[PDB]
Design a protein around this ligand. Structure first.
Ligand SMILES: Nc1ncnc2c1ncn2[C@@H]1O[C@H](COP(=O)(O)OP(=O)(O)OP(=O)(O)O)[C@@H](O)[C@H]1O
Ligand SMILES: Nc1ncnc2c1ncn2[C@@H]1O[C@H](COP(=O)(O)OP(=O)(O)OP(=O)(O)O)[C@@H](O)[C@H]1O
Ligand SMILES: CNC1=NC(=O)[C@H]([C@H](C)c2c[nH]c3ccccc23)O1
Ligand SMILES: CNC1=NC(=O)[C@H]([C@H](C)c2c[nH]c3ccccc23)O1
Ligand SMILES: [Mg+2]
Ligand SMILES: [Mg+2]
Lengths: 328, 328
């Protein structure tokens, strides 16, 4: 049969052009060639503080945006993580498989915890939850951005450990990281990736930003003083990132854009890029407002959770049977 | 209405006279005065390696022993933890509430991990699972042995944190630790508690040990060379522990036993204690074999899980609503 895809996005804010370019844009292509599960992973979002009203709102917005960008609910399964208890069940079992040392050495943990104050346990232990998200659906392929590469590697290790300790049950999944746009950088700090939970809203463009806002954010994007538009990731990380965004959203190659802007300044380059982004987001936002106004949004998520529960609950039964939990 | 009790025992082996004296014996009394939930916590057991066949077997044996000691399934709710998904769901939410530092400072973790080799994450993170076990049922009272005192204190902290961060939802539970027998000591190392997962079977007496075996284990119990039977926890921890077991199982006070064995040796004292233990276990074992032979054991657990799911799933809904997970 068809190979299986699973991917998740946190409702920790409104998704960014980084999320779009790095992941969501490819979901829309993949849905026709694979058995696809695309998840709103709200249990991942609460690994740090979320205002309850904002979280509820962002869950619905993410669902609407999934559909607005062109995911077809008849070709892919769209659902909310917490509405499928199997994810928490399998997460616990995999927490008993993973070693503490493996979690502590994770790059993303050591980064998000540096400055600690106090760190929730969830921030340390979300990787086995992610592994459960993937392994529950006998997933073959996991489309993600570059920053999730190590997490997929851990998932593969956990799957193999379980398989050899108890018996062959899990498919060993493989990451699919796009050749371009797998790490869109922050607009205000071109050495960090763009993150939808950045405390500085200028760092990112959300798919729901209006024209004025996008113009402002691109205008204030950090650049060098050299005044020349060419790609150089080491010497010109800001302009390089903007070129990468321009390129993947316009269809023009970086090399083509360099020529188009030969003898031109950053001012006109930024003004142009803003409009490219705006025109890209325009049809997305129109369809988004449609979904936010309808009961059909809830019906899609209802049906998706129904489907996901049937598949995931069966895998939980098999996992329990392998470990000896519960009863025959 | 009636106040609510919750307590759990791991199917990590066959329960001991330590488990009996410290917890299970009091369950049988409490069931008539309170709304009681008594749980076979198999998700706790897998925080360390369990052979799947042994685990399945120990789950059933624990259920049978719960009933054999006199727990009435019409007066208390008896169920298996993994058959109620709400425990894993609530555990994850509480993992996002607890801080890593709080888990690392737990005495039981620092002890069970010293020697580390490799430590499962579950061994670090089972306290929030325990907190979920308790808080899901609006529990007022938690009957446990001394070693779980710090865990109940953490549970109270987590409940308060949730209540003040989101809104009053949880009852703040209170530990009930018996005045006598809250920490029965190992037979081979009187400075450690008796534990059903001890690698040395001589350390404990299980409720299923036969007469020959009990005689052997009591005979080899570590004692001093002083040859006098009197209670002195510091100077005579072995004989003191044996006196404590003799006392709580026979009904005689320690002071009475000291007199009864004045001018007597450890040999006759140990031979007598063995028979006291044997006669205590005799009716328990008879009823145990009855339950292991019947389909009614499964029917009891079916009904218990049904009841527990109704109560716990509703609390999960309230927790999710408070945190903003899922949908309205
Ligand atoms: N700058 C980026 N470029 C490309 N892909 C990204 C970027 N940031 C995140 N992603 C991808 O989008 C996905 C969803 O991740 P996530 O929901 O964590 O978004 P995020 O922006 O990192 O939010 P948060 O700041 O809350 O971590 C993952 O597949 C991840 O690889
Ligand atoms: N020596 C003991 N004396 C009194 N109570 C005990 C003793 N050991 C455990 N308990 C109690 O019995 C309970 C069930 O605990 P648990 O299932 O962890 O048993 P355990 O013997 O500690 O097993 P393990 O060795 O797997 O930890 C708890 O309420 C605990 O306080
Ligand atoms: C904080 N949790 C988290 N950050 C991430 O980037 C991952 C993502 C969002 C994720 C969770 N489950 C997944 C399954 C497949 C692909 C990505 C994810 O989780
Ligand atoms: C390793 N897990 C663990 N050890 C313990 O002693 C506790 C006990 C068994 C426990 C788990 N949930 C509970 C709820 C109420 C009373 C005791 C427990 O858990
Ligand atoms: Mg992220
Ligand atoms: Mg214990």
């Amino acid at each position: 049969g068809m190979k299986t895809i699973f991917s998740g996005i946190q409702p920790s804010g409104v998704i960014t052009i980084g999320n779009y370019i790095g992941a969501l844009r490819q979901f829309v292509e993949l849905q026709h060639e694979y058995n696809c599960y695309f998840c709103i992973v709200d249990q991942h979002a609460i690994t740090v503080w979320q205002d309850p009203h904002e979280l509820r709102q962002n869950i619905r917005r993410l669902a609407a945006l999934y559909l607005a960008v062109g995911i077809d609910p008849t070709q892919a399964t769209l659902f909310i993580q917490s509405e499928v208890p199997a994810h928490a069940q399998a997460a616990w079992m995999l927490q008993c498989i993973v070693y503490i040392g493996e979690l502590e050495r994770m790059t993303q943990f050591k980064e998000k915890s540096a400055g600690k104050e106090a760190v929730s346990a969830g921030l340390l232990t979300y990787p086995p939850l992610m592994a459960a998200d993937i392994l529950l659906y006998n997933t073959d392929i996991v489309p993600v951005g570059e920053d999730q590469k190590q997490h997929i590697e851990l998932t593969r290790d956990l799957a193999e450990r379980f398989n050899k300790r108890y018996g062959e049950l899990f498919t060993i999944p493989e990451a699919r990281i796009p050749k371009v746009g797998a790490r869109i950088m922050s607009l205000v700090d071109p050495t960090k990736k763009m993150s939808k939970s950045d405390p500085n809203p200028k760092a990112y463009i959300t798919l729901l930003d209006d024209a004025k806002t996008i113009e402002k954010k691109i205008k204030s994007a950090v650049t060098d003083s050299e005044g020349t538009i060419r790609y150089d990731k080491e010497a010109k990380p800001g302009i390089s990132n903007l070129l990468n965004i321009y390129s993947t959203l316009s269809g023009q190659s970086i090399e083509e854009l360099e020529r188009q802007y030969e003898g031109k300044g950053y001012g006109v380059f930024k003004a142009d890029l803003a409009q490219v982004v705006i025109e890209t987001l325009r049809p997305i936002q129109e369809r988004y407002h449609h979904w936010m106004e309808s009961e059909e949004l809830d019906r899609v998520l209802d049906e998706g959770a129904e489907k996901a529960n049937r598949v995931a609950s069966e895998m939980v039964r098999k996992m329990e049977q392998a470990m000896g939990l519960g009863r025959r």
